[PDB]
Homo-oligomer: A and B are copies of this chain.
């Protein structure tokens, strides 16, 4: 029924708060990947042999 189908789509948390949690997690992902990429490019430009899957 409709009320059951509607209930499953309503979170206990406000959508504003859910959106804030999305942005916070995306920011961290992007910061972590950048931190990693900065390490990797340093290795690429010094001793890229470190990157070989042997």
Contacts and interface: CB of A to CB of B under 8 A. Distances in A.
**Majority SS at the chain A contact face:** helix
Interface of A: 8-11, 14-15, 18, 21-22, 25-26, 28-29, 32-33, 35-36, 39
A25 B36 contact: no
Nearest to A40: B39
Contacts of A22: 21, 25
**Oligomeric state, in copies:** 2
Nearest to A33: B32
Most buried by B among A14, A29, A32, A33: A32
B32 A36 contact: yes
A54 to B, nearest CB: 17
